[model samples]
Target: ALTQPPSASGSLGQSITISCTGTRSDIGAYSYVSWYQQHPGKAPKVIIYEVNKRPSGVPDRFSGSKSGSTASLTVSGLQADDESTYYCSSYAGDKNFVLFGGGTKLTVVGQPKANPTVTLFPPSSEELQANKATLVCLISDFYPGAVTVAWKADSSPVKAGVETTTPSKQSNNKYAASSYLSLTPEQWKSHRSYSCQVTHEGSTVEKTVAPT
Candidate 1:
């Protein structure tokens, strides 16, 4: 198996590097090492292959190299657009199939930042059917675009009847998504408060509302 960091960070005009470590039976034995870049809401693109060869149309700012049992990918002259998730792939010996790293997310520093605006909306009269209620958690206007949504009732964690949609990009490059929680009216009214929490960039924002 391959290993990678969960995150890497750099500033514009600066350079950053991430390393992938594998065993001698894999990356060290085979010369087929490749790197991929993935942006949010997009497909992954190969940036480097065969350890150090950049593919056609890829910028020279991205480079790959290997040493011992580890492979590395470096990005020079980083830009805001360079912020993305990267993966490393290698061909193991015949005994083992291709191996992929866990992936690393590169964040360019000094970019504009905004906290997500979270709002909890109670179930409308029509939405309350057969003593069941649906709660809508609206998340909006978050920068860097990645956010996680969670639900809680009366300060305890909620696990069931929760659905969170993929964050959708807005015209301003911010993101928005909705989380839903379904509950019985008795369950809803039993709690003093219901909360919707949105997490991003190691920080969390929450909104709590009472049941109607």
Candidate 2:
């Protein structure tokens, strides 16, 4: 449980600091305290490990520093779209036990066009016969944001098997997310009337697939 956290605000240029506070069990004497970078609806990516070590390919804009029971994350020369939710975790005085702290928001205060291009992909014929059918919805080129999804079988609601993945950031300073739908071949073959609708910023991009 993170007892004390702060809100960071900056606009496009200044370096903003986000710190995590904890106890001696996890943050002070523990073997590890890791920092993660995450956006809304996206999974966390560990940016700093073992107190303050950057993973490969992570940019130098992020810096990690720690003191007794407290670790601070600093960002330098920040960008407008750098706003994100940061999380921290550490070992619970042992390698086997780990405790996760709460998330802190860094409001960088800026964006671009922020357009999310979405596409729908139907299951292949081979996959349809492989005991189950799966459909994929690829949504790409957006900001650190939210996108809702819906499934329709030509006017019927989808309630069974579905999974929505995290909005992953790409190298081009954008975001991407995906949603998966699973169904039995029996349901898929019933007129092949499956559809996917991806909604982002008041726009719902939809596509439908039928049997060939």
**Candidate number achieving the greatest lDDT relative to the actual structure:** 1
Which candidate tops TM-score?
1
Question: Per-residue alpha-carbon lDDT of model 2 for 74-122, expressed as tens digits?
Answer: 8888885566778888887745877777777776656555868878877
- Runs off by more than 4 Å, candidate 1: 114-173, 178-212
lDDT to native, each model: 0.87, 0.77
* Candidate 2 accuracy as TM-score: 0.58
- For model 1, residues 1-212, the per-residue Cα lDDT tens digits are 89999999898788999999998888888889999988777899999999999999999999999998899999999877777789999998666678899999887887778888888898776766666798999888887778888888989999898999988765455678889998988878778988888898879988888865
Q: Residue 187 in candidate 2 has what lDDT?
A: 72
Error of 2 at 18 (Å): 4.6
lDDT of 1 at 72: 97
lDDT assessment of candidate 1: 0.87
